[PDB]
Design a protein around this ligand. Sequence first.
Ligand SMILES: NC(=O)c1ccc[n+]([C@@H]2O[C@H](COP(=O)([O-])OP(=O)(O)OC[C@H]3O[C@@H](n4cnc5c(N)ncnc54)[C@H](OP(=O)(O)O)[C@@H]3O)[C@@H](O)[C@H]2O)c1
Ligand SMILES: [Cl-]
Length: 175
Amino acid sequence: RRLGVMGGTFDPIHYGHLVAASEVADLFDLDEVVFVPSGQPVSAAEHRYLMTVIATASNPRFSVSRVDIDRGGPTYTKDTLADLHALHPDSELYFTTGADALASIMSWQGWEELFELARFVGVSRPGYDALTLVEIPALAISSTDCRQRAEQSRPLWYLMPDGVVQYVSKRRLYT
Ligand SMILES: NC(=O)c1ccc[n+]([C@@H]2O[C@H](COP(=O)([O-])OP(=O)(O)OC[C@H]3O[C@@H](n4cnc5c(N)ncnc54)[C@H](OP(=O)(O)O)[C@@H]3O)[C@@H](O)[C@H]2O)c1
Ligand SMILES: [Cl-]
């Protein structure tokens, strides 16, 4: 059994993330991908959790975990991987996040134990065994650009699911 772990802030989640998760699951024959919004270091954790639930609900092989949000302090991936390993003891873990996030991995706590717990996948827009880098054209879509568009009342339609567009708008997240 093989479980993707999509780690990120997801403020907001967008089609880039969803495309990336879908491709990585196909590339590595993953049975499921669990999205793990990171803890409060940015919109409140509950907003980021709900947007990610909204965005992933329709995919039978996506889910969302609260392990980082409910942990208590800032998020360290050694703790995310320990929590998920305890929850899914039989699954091989494929930790997936932005390649630019993973460029600082040598400063993350438990750097050596991280690779005992998971294989790592860095996804990026084009032109960027233990770490595999994967280029995803749809990751040209960025959460920063999404927040700026919302701030400027420019449309978010087709950059993320309709439910996320409307959540961002009616909860006034970036205005
Ligand atoms: N001490 C540690 O253990 C440590 C330190 C740093 C990070 N991390 C972990 O690394 C993950 C990423 O951290 P972060 O969100 O802080 O990164 P970030 O700095 O917000 O993101 C950096 C880049 O990665 C992209 N990105 C982030 N998550 C992604 C995903 N799941 N798929 C595709 N692109 C992604 C971002 O694009 P968007 O803005 O479009 O998402 C951005 O281009 C989190 O799970 C975090 O807990 C751990
Ligand atoms: Cl879920």
